[PDB]
Amino acid sequence: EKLVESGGGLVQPGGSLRLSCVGSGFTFSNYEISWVRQAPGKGLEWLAGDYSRGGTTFYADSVKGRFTISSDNSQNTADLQMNSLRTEDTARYYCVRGVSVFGVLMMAMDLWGPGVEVVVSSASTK
Amino acid sequence: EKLVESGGGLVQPGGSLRLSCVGSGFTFSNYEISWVRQAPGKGLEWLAGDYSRGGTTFYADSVKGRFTISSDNSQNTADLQMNSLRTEDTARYYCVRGVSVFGVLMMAMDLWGPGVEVVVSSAST
Amino acid sequence: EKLVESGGGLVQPGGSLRLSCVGSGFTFSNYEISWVRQAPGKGLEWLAGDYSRGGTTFYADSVKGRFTISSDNSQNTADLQMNSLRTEDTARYYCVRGVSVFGVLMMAMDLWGPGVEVVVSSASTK
Amino acid sequence: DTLCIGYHANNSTDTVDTVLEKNVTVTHSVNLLEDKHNGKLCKLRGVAPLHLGKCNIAGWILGNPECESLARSWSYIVETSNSDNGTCYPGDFINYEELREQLSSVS
Amino acid sequence: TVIQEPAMSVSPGGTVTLTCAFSSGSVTTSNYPSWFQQTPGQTPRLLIYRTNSRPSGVPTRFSGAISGNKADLIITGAQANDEADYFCNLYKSSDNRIFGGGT
Amino acid sequence: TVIQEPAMSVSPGGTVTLTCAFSSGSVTTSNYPSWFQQTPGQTPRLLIYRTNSRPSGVPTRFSGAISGNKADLIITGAQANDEADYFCNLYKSSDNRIFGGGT
Amino acid sequence: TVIQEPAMSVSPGGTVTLTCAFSSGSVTTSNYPSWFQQTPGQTPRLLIYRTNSRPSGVPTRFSGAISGNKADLIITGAQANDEADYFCNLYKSSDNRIFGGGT
Amino acid sequence: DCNTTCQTPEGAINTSLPFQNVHPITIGKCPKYVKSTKLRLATGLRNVP
Amino acid sequence: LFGAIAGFIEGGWTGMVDGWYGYHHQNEQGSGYAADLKSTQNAIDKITNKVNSVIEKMNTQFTAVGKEFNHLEKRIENLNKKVDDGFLDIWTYNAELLVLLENERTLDYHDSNVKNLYEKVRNQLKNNAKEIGNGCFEFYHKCDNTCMESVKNGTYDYPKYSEEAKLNR
Amino acid sequence: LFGAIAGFIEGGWTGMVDGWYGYHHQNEQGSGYAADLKSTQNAIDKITNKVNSVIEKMNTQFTAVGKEFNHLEKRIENLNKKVDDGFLDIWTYNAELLVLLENERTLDYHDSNVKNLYEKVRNQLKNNAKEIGNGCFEFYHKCDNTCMESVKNGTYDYPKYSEEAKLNR
Amino acid sequence: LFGAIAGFIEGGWTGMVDGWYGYHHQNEQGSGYAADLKSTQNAIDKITNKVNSVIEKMNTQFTAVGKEFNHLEKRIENLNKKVDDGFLDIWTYNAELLVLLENERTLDYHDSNVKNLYEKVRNQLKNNAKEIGNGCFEFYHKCDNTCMESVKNGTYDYPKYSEEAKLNR
């Protein structure tokens, strides 16, 4: 049972970046997939959540209107698309799964992924 | 699917008469059988109604105490008996069929019969 | 068919005594077993009752704390144990059966036993 | 100051059938029916099947010379739709189906 | 306690009513009057339960009712084998089931 | 009683509305308006029942509605087969089902 | 926002309580407090959810409660593996799930 | 190379579900064959957004 | 059918994901959705038991459905076909009807839970609040967060705000 | 069982034939019966679906029940008899039990509908009318046929007659 | 599920052995329990009918399960065995599910009876008594044994104590 993230890198401010999380060992149908970011030095910040079977999508007030989360249960993937990225969006991103029995969330973020680093610095690569 | 009426003719005022209506192509059980008359020149007038499976019978105020309607689902027939016929009862009588689902009348008189002419004139034949 | 009582005799005041009632022809499971005493000359007096399948035991105010009634449905037996017997407890005792349908008593004592005589006289046996 | 009592709803499209009305949208529903198979003839109780490719049981148990390509135990036998190699010499195999029933699984 | 008539008698073939009352309260159907018969020297026999119900062996002539805040046992056509002591049992509580004095 | 327009006329290809009213009350869905058509010398046929329901043989051009405390039958694109007497039946009670005068 | 103690220390074999609070409200079981553990440079681990429930791999010594309008995580008999950042997640709304500062 | 509890000519069925509609001819501990196409058990409440 | 879901409460809440039934409160400090932990947990347990009872009560044995008969045994083959089809018919009818009935039972269970929650709140508040109709109560007094979590727990304190409610009525 | 049919409403109306559930109004301009269109139509549709589910969920295949065996195949004949009698018992028990429970469901459904209609009218009227008895409301104002039809439609206006009702109460 | 047993009446009475559903009265003249005769008798009859329907609807014919086949008839033996275990699974699943559902029906029946009794007493007393919580009414007037027996019989007289209740309210 693991969640593996991909799609990190360097993006200029105002750009767009897409992160993908693929899960093995279980089915995405009976879980809610959320994205949690950790800035250097600061703490965790919950960003978005998707219950694909219930067709429900929830966003934090900080990333509302910019980020968009989608899920595909057949391919067992979850994608987060980030637009109008700001300098304060640089962080390590985690694809976490939360338990949902009978369509009801129990706030149990049991499994986390290693995470992917996203740097939104405007400096050029050296 | 048809309703055929019989039993019309000429009777003297104060007399009695009986019309019968036989239905072919359906069952009388799941329908309500009513009798509607049309006077010469005037309009239609509902007289009586019978729901045999529910054992319910309804009469208009104009024919209450004079007309009696009976039904037989086994033979698929419905009869109307007239007593103390007045001169204003000369008309063409129709045996109409109304839709009833689950014992509830839907007020849908969809099938009509040709009708039988009844004359209660006192004149000689 | 029948209820047979046993265990009567003569005891001294302040003594103890056990009466047993064995029922034949029916099952004790779906009945209540009560004990009714008739003093010489006086009338009947209900003493105790047991519904074993419901596990309910009822005692009269006169014999509360002195009489204890137990039942065994497997062996179809009903026992009444008397402690601190007084001189006014000399009587003929009956093991009576009361009808109960679906756990509800219907106040119908339909079958009575022959009865057993109990004497609590302090006089010695001659 | 207001306190409302209510219930949960979601954007789900799974419908269930009810004795009084069909196609009822519910928040969640489980499946009691299985429609999928892996598409392989896998082992039963940890024991592999006896696969007779171009032979049937008659040819395999009699020793057809085109059966030498083909276990000490098995849980069931698998024959192909093209397994036409059996009794090469014409004749009748007495109680053939009884033999096939006995040979279905051997310890 | 329960009050009952201490003695009453009727001529053969006649009718009689036996009354059972409370000392201070009222007799209701919820009190479940029951009527037992005891020939002297014999075990009691249940005649009426729940004020109107007789077992499968009691003769029809025995009947019961509630009248005038009391429980009544009616014998119609008294025979010679109806000479016995009659008891009334009234249910007041789970621990309180009171038998009558007798008749 | 039920009031209906005694006579109305329409031009071919046009639309017409026939009204049916109570003498002193208001017409509602609970009155179950029904509309019948009768070519003279023939048995009446059911065009509309329950104010909006058409039998399986009635042309689509016949429709019904309730407007202004009245029951309305709408004919769109009247052909030459629509020259007939039109009747409205209103349900007031089990023993009272009133037919219109006719149009 | 969520207020947490910025740094606390314990002696090995002892007990410690970590406190999570709201800036302006009260912490209730309806807020479903959760406690996560993160060794630096590693993915966070779910220790406790719903204030009293532990996943199938968390040691028994970890416990949770709600005391004095605050959420408490109790570590009894800490080893050297307990040197990590402890985070509290409080559920305020569907779109509002607040993580703590850390300890 | 597998481990399965129910085998059909087309393939193996691996589930705890009591009914299946893949094949009547089955070998092993198998779900009962029904001619149904959709047997869904309602678990949550009626969705009325 | 107890007339709650689609009855006097004509809508569901999509922002409430922590439970199945519960409350929406609006006071001076704020507004929010909260689930009824007890009712939701009990319902979840009951439905879990229901699903497990439907699934696990089916016992099966090692079976080898399918036999081979030669041309001279067309009667035994027909008998085997009869055995198979009868079983298929029985199981189809039983499965469909069981699902149809059980779905009804589940939906009315949820309706009953909503109605019971509404009844509990109503009997707690008595006349300290008033029923506006859509499942809500308007308080005649001022119920702060503490008072609200008291209502959502069964520990309402009617003789604490009785006087204020009487004054404001 | 809810308590309406035979409960607090002790009798039915033979004169109401246009529906299953309904109202009887009496005012200064007339009295009469009128069925509730929405509830009656919904109930008719649901009962139709119930009957169709009971009838059409039973599939059938071409079968030739009945086999021929000589005197030397008595065992196979007894096996055929066993199959036939087992199927007969299964189907008999299933049919009787299904009908017995389904009738309970139907009667309880109608009782629930009556109770819910009464509750709707009660919650609409509030204290503008009193509950006198067997499902009857006595108005404190003067409802004309427009007001009564509003009560039967779902669009009753409590603020409009509230003042008159308060005066008469 | 209605909400009586385990709901607003959170305890049973061991002292009420005369029936299933009843009353406990306390006045200046006495206190005690008393079963409701009508509801208890109806419930007893209905449960008796339910048990008899579950039991007596099973029809059985004289059967001789158990057949003998030699080693050359293994296929017919396996067919007989298949018939046997198929019947076994059908009957096991049907019996288990039937009992599981019938227990639900019975418990819901008892809960509905308790709720209906409470509703009947409530609608009889009206505002002559107040609901003091756990399934109990405090009278605003003086109920003697006759008044209580009238409440339990169904013939309570609201106009008779209305004036006293108004004075004490």
PDB file of N, CA, C and O in Angstrom, chain B residues 40-92:
ATOM      1  N   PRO B  40     -83.643  14.814 -26.699  1.00  0.00           N
ATOM      2  CA  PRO B  40     -83.712  15.434 -28.030  1.00  0.00           C
ATOM      3  C   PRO B  40     -83.518  16.939 -27.971  1.00  0.00           C
ATOM      4  O   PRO B  40     -84.351  17.660 -27.413  1.00  0.00           O
ATOM      5  N   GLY B  41     -82.419  17.424 -28.545  1.00  0.00           N
ATOM      6  CA  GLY B  41     -82.102  18.831 -28.563  1.00  0.00           C
ATOM      7  C   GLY B  41     -81.287  19.318 -27.381  1.00  0.00           C
ATOM      8  O   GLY B  41     -80.441  20.202 -27.548  1.00  0.00           O
ATOM      9  N   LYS B  42     -81.515  18.763 -26.195  1.00  0.00           N
ATOM     10  CA  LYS B  42     -80.790  19.180 -25.003  1.00  0.00           C
ATOM     11  C   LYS B  42     -79.435  18.475 -24.955  1.00  0.00           C
ATOM     12  O   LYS B  42     -79.003  17.835 -25.917  1.00  0.00           O
ATOM     13  N   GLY B  43     -78.739  18.592 -23.823  1.00  0.00           N
ATOM     14  CA  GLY B  43     -77.413  18.042 -23.674  1.00  0.00           C
ATOM     15  C   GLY B  43     -77.397  16.729 -22.904  1.00  0.00           C
ATOM     16  O   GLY B  43     -78.425  16.162 -22.544  1.00  0.00           O
ATOM     17  N   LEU B  44     -76.182  16.250 -22.658  1.00  0.00           N
ATOM     18  CA  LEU B  44     -75.990  14.989 -21.965  1.00  0.00           C
ATOM     19  C   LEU B  44     -76.314  15.134 -20.481  1.00  0.00           C
ATOM     20  O   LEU B  44     -76.285  16.227 -19.913  1.00  0.00           O
ATOM     21  N   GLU B  45     -76.633  14.005 -19.851  1.00  0.00           N
ATOM     22  CA  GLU B  45     -76.972  13.984 -18.432  1.00  0.00           C
ATOM     23  C   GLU B  45     -76.553  12.650 -17.838  1.00  0.00           C
ATOM     24  O   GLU B  45     -77.012  11.599 -18.289  1.00  0.00           O
ATOM     25  N   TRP B  46     -75.686  12.699 -16.832  1.00  0.00           N
ATOM     26  CA  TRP B  46     -75.247  11.501 -16.130  1.00  0.00           C
ATOM     27  C   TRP B  46     -76.347  11.034 -15.188  1.00  0.00           C
ATOM     28  O   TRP B  46     -76.944  11.844 -14.474  1.00  0.00           O
ATOM     29  N   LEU B  47     -76.619   9.730 -15.184  1.00  0.00           N
ATOM     30  CA  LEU B  47     -77.721   9.178 -14.408  1.00  0.00           C
ATOM     31  C   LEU B  47     -77.254   8.281 -13.270  1.00  0.00           C
ATOM     32  O   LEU B  47     -77.601   8.521 -12.112  1.00  0.00           O
ATOM     33  N   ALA B  48     -76.482   7.241 -13.566  1.00  0.00           N
ATOM     34  CA  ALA B  48     -76.111   6.277 -12.546  1.00  0.00           C
ATOM     35  C   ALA B  48     -74.742   5.709 -12.864  1.00  0.00           C
ATOM     36  O   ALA B  48     -74.276   5.756 -14.004  1.00  0.00           O
ATOM     37  N   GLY B  49     -74.103   5.166 -11.835  1.00  0.00           N
ATOM     38  CA  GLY B  49     -72.801   4.550 -11.968  1.00  0.00           C
ATOM     39  C   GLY B  49     -72.638   3.387 -11.015  1.00  0.00           C
ATOM     40  O   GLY B  49     -73.113   3.440  -9.877  1.00  0.00           O
ATOM     41  N   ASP B  50     -71.966   2.333 -11.463  1.00  0.00           N
ATOM     42  CA  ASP B  50     -71.790   1.123 -10.677  1.00  0.00           C
ATOM     43  C   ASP B  50     -70.354   0.645 -10.795  1.00  0.00           C
ATOM     44  O   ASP B  50     -69.842   0.478 -11.907  1.00  0.00           O
ATOM     45  N   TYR B  51     -69.715   0.431  -9.651  1.00  0.00           N
ATOM     46  CA  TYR B  51     -68.426  -0.242  -9.569  1.00  0.00           C
ATOM     47  C   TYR B  51     -68.672  -1.555  -8.838  1.00  0.00           C
ATOM     48  O   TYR B  51     -68.863  -1.567  -7.615  1.00  0.00           O
ATOM     49  N   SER B  52     -68.696  -2.650  -9.598  1.00  0.00           N
ATOM     50  CA  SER B  52     -69.150  -3.932  -9.075  1.00  0.00           C
ATOM     51  C   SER B  52     -68.126  -4.564  -8.145  1.00  0.00           C
ATOM     52  O   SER B  52     -68.494  -5.151  -7.124  1.00  0.00           O
ATOM     53  N   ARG B  53     -66.842  -4.467  -8.486  1.00  0.00           N
ATOM     54  CA  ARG B  53     -65.817  -5.050  -7.633  1.00  0.00           C
ATOM     55  C   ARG B  53     -65.767  -4.365  -6.276  1.00  0.00           C
ATOM     56  O   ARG B  53     -65.516  -5.022  -5.260  1.00  0.00           O
ATOM     57  N   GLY B  54     -65.999  -3.057  -6.237  1.00  0.00           N
ATOM     58  CA  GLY B  54     -66.098  -2.337  -4.988  1.00  0.00           C
ATOM     59  C   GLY B  54     -67.471  -2.309  -4.372  1.00  0.00           C
ATOM     60  O   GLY B  54     -67.630  -1.795  -3.262  1.00  0.00           O
ATOM     61  N   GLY B  55     -68.471  -2.850  -5.059  1.00  0.00           N
ATOM     62  CA  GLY B  55     -69.822  -2.860  -4.531  1.00  0.00           C
ATOM     63  C   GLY B  55     -70.395  -1.486  -4.292  1.00  0.00           C
ATOM     64  O   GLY B  55     -71.159  -1.298  -3.341  1.00  0.00           O
ATOM     65  N   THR B  56     -70.052  -0.515  -5.131  1.00  0.00           N
ATOM     66  CA  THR B  56     -70.489   0.860  -4.946  1.00  0.00           C
ATOM     67  C   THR B  56     -71.436   1.269  -6.064  1.00  0.00           C
ATOM     68  O   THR B  56     -71.244   0.897  -7.226  1.00  0.00           O
ATOM     69  N   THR B  57     -72.456   2.037  -5.699  1.00  0.00           N
ATOM     70  CA  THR B  57     -73.486   2.481  -6.624  1.00  0.00           C
ATOM     71  C   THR B  57     -73.801   3.938  -6.343  1.00  0.00           C
ATOM     72  O   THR B  57     -73.981   4.319  -5.183  1.00  0.00           O
ATOM     73  N   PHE B  58     -73.869   4.748  -7.393  1.00  0.00           N
ATOM     74  CA  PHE B  58     -74.116   6.175  -7.256  1.00  0.00           C
ATOM     75  C   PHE B  58     -75.198   6.610  -8.227  1.00  0.00           C
ATOM     76  O   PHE B  58     -75.199   6.201  -9.389  1.00  0.00           O
ATOM     77  N   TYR B  59     -76.120   7.438  -7.748  1.00  0.00           N
ATOM     78  CA  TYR B  59     -77.238   7.905  -8.553  1.00  0.00           C
ATOM     79  C   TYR B  59     -77.297   9.420  -8.536  1.00  0.00           C
ATOM     80  O   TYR B  59     -77.007  10.052  -7.516  1.00  0.00           O
ATOM     81  N   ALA B  60     -77.679   9.998  -9.668  1.00  0.00           N
ATOM     82  CA  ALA B  60     -77.948  11.422  -9.723  1.00  0.00           C
ATOM     83  C   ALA B  60     -79.231  11.737  -8.972  1.00  0.00           C
ATOM     84  O   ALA B  60     -80.097  10.880  -8.789  1.00  0.00           O
ATOM     85  N   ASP B  61     -79.350  12.989  -8.528  1.00  0.00           N
ATOM     86  CA  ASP B  61     -80.536  13.402  -7.790  1.00  0.00           C
ATOM     87  C   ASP B  61     -81.797  13.341  -8.639  1.00  0.00           C
ATOM     88  O   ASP B  61     -82.895  13.219  -8.090  1.00  0.00           O
ATOM     89  N   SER B  62     -81.665  13.419  -9.963  1.00  0.00           N
ATOM     90  CA  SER B  62     -82.842  13.399 -10.821  1.00  0.00           C
ATOM     91  C   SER B  62     -83.464  12.011 -10.908  1.00  0.00           C
ATOM     92  O   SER B  62     -84.666  11.891 -11.166  1.00  0.00           O
ATOM     93  N   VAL B  63     -82.676  10.955 -10.701  1.00  0.00           N
ATOM     94  CA  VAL B  63     -83.148   9.589 -10.870  1.00  0.00           C
ATOM     95  C   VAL B  63     -83.051   8.778  -9.586  1.00  0.00           C
ATOM     96  O   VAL B  63     -83.200   7.558  -9.618  1.00  0.00           O
ATOM     97  N   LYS B  64     -82.807   9.425  -8.454  1.00  0.00           N
ATOM     98  CA  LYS B  64     -82.701   8.700  -7.197  1.00  0.00           C
ATOM     99  C   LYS B  64     -84.073   8.211  -6.757  1.00  0.00           C
ATOM    100  O   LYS B  64     -85.034   8.983  -6.707  1.00  0.00           O
ATOM    101  N   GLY B  65     -84.162   6.922  -6.438  1.00  0.00           N
ATOM    102  CA  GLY B  65     -85.412   6.309  -6.055  1.00  0.00           C
ATOM    103  C   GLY B  65     -86.228   5.757  -7.202  1.00  0.00           C
ATOM    104  O   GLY B  65     -87.231   5.076  -6.954  1.00  0.00           O
ATOM    105  N   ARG B  66     -85.835   6.023  -8.443  1.00  0.00           N
ATOM    106  CA  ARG B  66     -86.528   5.524  -9.622  1.00  0.00           C
ATOM    107  C   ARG B  66     -85.684   4.549 -10.425  1.00  0.00           C
ATOM    108  O   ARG B  66     -86.166   3.482 -10.813  1.00  0.00           O
ATOM    109  N   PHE B  67     -84.428   4.893 -10.683  1.00  0.00           N
ATOM    110  CA  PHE B  67     -83.533   4.052 -11.460  1.00  0.00           C
ATOM    111  C   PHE B  67     -82.740   3.159 -10.519  1.00  0.00           C
ATOM    112  O   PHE B  67     -82.322   3.590  -9.443  1.00  0.00           O
ATOM    113  N   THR B  68     -82.542   1.912 -10.926  1.00  0.00           N
ATOM    114  CA  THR B  68     -81.679   0.990 -10.202  1.00  0.00           C
ATOM    115  C   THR B  68     -80.733   0.325 -11.188  1.00  0.00           C
ATOM    116  O   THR B  68     -81.178  -0.265 -12.173  1.00  0.00           O
ATOM    117  N   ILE B  69     -79.436   0.418 -10.924  1.00  0.00           N
ATOM    118  CA  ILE B  69     -78.414  -0.129 -11.806  1.00  0.00           C
ATOM    119  C   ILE B  69     -77.803  -1.350 -11.139  1.00  0.00           C
ATOM    120  O   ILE B  69     -77.552  -1.351  -9.928  1.00  0.00           O
ATOM    121  N   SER B  70     -77.606  -2.403 -11.922  1.00  0.00           N
ATOM    122  CA  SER B  70     -77.003  -3.640 -11.456  1.00  0.00           C
ATOM    123  C   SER B  70     -75.944  -4.074 -12.456  1.00  0.00           C
ATOM    124  O   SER B  70     -75.973  -3.685 -13.623  1.00  0.00           O
ATOM    125  N   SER B  71     -74.993  -4.873 -11.989  1.00  0.00           N
ATOM    126  CA  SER B  71     -73.912  -5.336 -12.845  1.00  0.00           C
ATOM    127  C   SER B  71     -73.611  -6.795 -12.548  1.00  0.00           C
ATOM    128  O   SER B  71     -73.807  -7.271 -11.427  1.00  0.00           O
ATOM    129  N   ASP B  72     -73.135  -7.502 -13.571  1.00  0.00           N
ATOM    130  CA  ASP B  72     -72.730  -8.899 -13.458  1.00  0.00           C
ATOM    131  C   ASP B  72     -71.416  -9.061 -14.206  1.00  0.00           C
ATOM    132  O   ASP B  72     -71.398  -9.073 -15.443  1.00  0.00           O
ATOM    133  N   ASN B  73     -70.318  -9.169 -13.457  1.00  0.00           N
ATOM    134  CA  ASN B  73     -69.002  -9.283 -14.074  1.00  0.00           C
ATOM    135  C   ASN B  73     -68.788 -10.654 -14.698  1.00  0.00           C
ATOM    136  O   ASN B  73     -68.026 -10.779 -15.663  1.00  0.00           O
ATOM    137  N   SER B  74     -69.435 -11.689 -14.160  1.00  0.00           N
ATOM    138  CA  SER B  74     -69.268 -13.032 -14.705  1.00  0.00           C
ATOM    139  C   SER B  74     -69.779 -13.110 -16.137  1.00  0.00           C
ATOM    140  O   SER B  74     -69.111 -13.663 -17.018  1.00  0.00           O
ATOM    141  N   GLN B  75     -70.957 -12.550 -16.392  1.00  0.00           N
ATOM    142  CA  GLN B  75     -71.527 -12.520 -17.729  1.00  0.00           C
ATOM    143  C   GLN B  75     -71.175 -11.253 -18.492  1.00  0.00           C
ATOM    144  O   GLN B  75     -71.565 -11.123 -19.657  1.00  0.00           O
ATOM    145  N   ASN B  76     -70.463 -10.318 -17.861  1.00  0.00           N
ATOM    146  CA  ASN B  76     -69.989  -9.098 -18.511  1.00  0.00           C
ATOM    147  C   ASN B  76     -71.154  -8.224 -18.972  1.00  0.00           C
ATOM    148  O   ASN B  76     -71.175  -7.722 -20.096  1.00  0.00           O
ATOM    149  N   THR B  77     -72.134  -8.038 -18.090  1.00  0.00           N
ATOM    150  CA  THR B  77     -73.328  -7.274 -18.423  1.00  0.00           C
ATOM    151  C   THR B  77     -73.612  -6.229 -17.356  1.00  0.00           C
ATOM    152  O   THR B  77     -73.158  -6.330 -16.214  1.00  0.00           O
ATOM    153  N   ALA B  78     -74.381  -5.216 -17.743  1.00  0.00           N
ATOM    154  CA  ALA B  78     -74.833  -4.191 -16.812  1.00  0.00           C
ATOM    155  C   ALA B  78     -76.234  -3.748 -17.197  1.00  0.00           C
ATOM    156  O   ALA B  78     -76.478  -3.400 -18.352  1.00  0.00           O
ATOM    157  N   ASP B  79     -77.144  -3.745 -16.232  1.00  0.00           N
ATOM    158  CA  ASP B  79     -78.545  -3.453 -16.475  1.00  0.00           C
ATOM    159  C   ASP B  79     -78.972  -2.199 -15.726  1.00  0.00           C
ATOM    160  O   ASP B  79     -78.468  -1.899 -14.642  1.00  0.00           O
ATOM    161  N   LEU B  80     -79.915  -1.473 -16.319  1.00  0.00           N
ATOM    162  CA  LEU B  80     -80.528  -0.301 -15.707  1.00  0.00           C
ATOM    163  C   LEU B  80     -82.037  -0.473 -15.760  1.00  0.00           C
ATOM    164  O   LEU B  80     -82.598  -0.707 -16.835  1.00  0.00           O
ATOM    165  N   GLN B  81     -82.693  -0.350 -14.608  1.00  0.00           N
ATOM    166  CA  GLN B  81     -84.131  -0.535 -14.489  1.00  0.00           C
ATOM    167  C   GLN B  81     -84.783   0.784 -14.106  1.00  0.00           C
ATOM    168  O   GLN B  81     -84.386   1.413 -13.119  1.00  0.00           O
ATOM    169  N   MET B  82     -85.783   1.192 -14.882  1.00  0.00           N
ATOM    170  CA  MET B  82     -86.484   2.452 -14.698  1.00  0.00           C
ATOM    171  C   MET B  82     -87.902   2.188 -14.224  1.00  0.00           C
ATOM    172  O   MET B  82     -88.626   1.387 -14.828  1.00  0.00           O
ATOM    173  N   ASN B  83     -88.294   2.871 -13.155  1.00  0.00           N
ATOM    174  CA  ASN B  83     -89.631   2.788 -12.598  1.00  0.00           C
ATOM    175  C   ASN B  83     -90.238   4.181 -12.535  1.00  0.00           C
ATOM    176  O   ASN B  83     -89.529   5.173 -12.338  1.00  0.00           O
ATOM    177  N   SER B  84     -91.559   4.243 -12.686  1.00  0.00           N
ATOM    178  CA  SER B  84     -92.311   5.497 -12.730  1.00  0.00           C
ATOM    179  C   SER B  84     -91.683   6.478 -13.719  1.00  0.00           C
ATOM    180  O   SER B  84     -91.274   7.585 -13.374  1.00  0.00           O
ATOM    181  N   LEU B  85     -91.614   6.041 -14.973  1.00  0.00           N
ATOM    182  CA  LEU B  85     -91.018   6.862 -16.015  1.00  0.00           C
ATOM    183  C   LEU B  85     -91.903   8.064 -16.323  1.00  0.00           C
ATOM    184  O   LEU B  85     -93.104   7.920 -16.565  1.00  0.00           O
ATOM    185  N   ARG B  86     -91.302   9.247 -16.321  1.00  0.00           N
ATOM    186  CA  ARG B  86     -91.992  10.487 -16.632  1.00  0.00           C
ATOM    187  C   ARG B  86     -91.809  10.831 -18.105  1.00  0.00           C
ATOM    188  O   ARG B  86     -90.990  10.242 -18.811  1.00  0.00           O
ATOM    189  N   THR B  87     -92.582  11.816 -18.562  1.00  0.00           N
ATOM    190  CA  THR B  87     -92.525  12.199 -19.967  1.00  0.00           C
ATOM    191  C   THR B  87     -91.200  12.857 -20.318  1.00  0.00           C
ATOM    192  O   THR B  87     -90.787  12.826 -21.482  1.00  0.00           O
ATOM    193  N   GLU B  88     -90.518  13.443 -19.339  1.00  0.00           N
ATOM    194  CA  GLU B  88     -89.239  14.094 -19.583  1.00  0.00           C
ATOM    195  C   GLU B  88     -88.074  13.116 -19.633  1.00  0.00           C
ATOM    196  O   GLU B  88     -86.927  13.554 -19.762  1.00  0.00           O
ATOM    197  N   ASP B  89     -88.335  11.815 -19.536  1.00  0.00           N
ATOM    198  CA  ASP B  89     -87.295  10.799 -19.574  1.00  0.00           C
ATOM    199  C   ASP B  89     -87.080  10.223 -20.967  1.00  0.00           C
ATOM    200  O   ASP B  89     -86.303   9.277 -21.118  1.00  0.00           O
ATOM    201  N   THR B  90     -87.748  10.758 -21.982  1.00  0.00           N
ATOM    202  CA  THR B  90     -87.547  10.289 -23.346  1.00  0.00           C
ATOM    203  C   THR B  90     -86.211  10.808 -23.858  1.00  0.00           C
ATOM    204  O   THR B  90     -86.001  12.022 -23.944  1.00  0.00           O
ATOM    205  N   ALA B  91     -85.308   9.896 -24.196  1.00  0.00           N
ATOM    206  CA  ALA B  91     -83.952  10.291 -24.559  1.00  0.00           C
ATOM    207  C   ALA B  91     -83.234   9.090 -25.156  1.00  0.00           C
ATOM    208  O   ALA B  91     -83.772   7.981 -25.217  1.00  0.00           O
ATOM    209  N   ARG B  92     -82.000   9.322 -25.590  1.00  0.00           N
ATOM    210  CA  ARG B  92     -81.116   8.266 -26.056  1.00  0.00           C
ATOM    211  C   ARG B  92     -80.156   7.918 -24.926  1.00  0.00           C
ATOM    212  O   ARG B  92     -79.468   8.799 -24.401  1.00  0.00           O
TER     213      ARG B  92
END
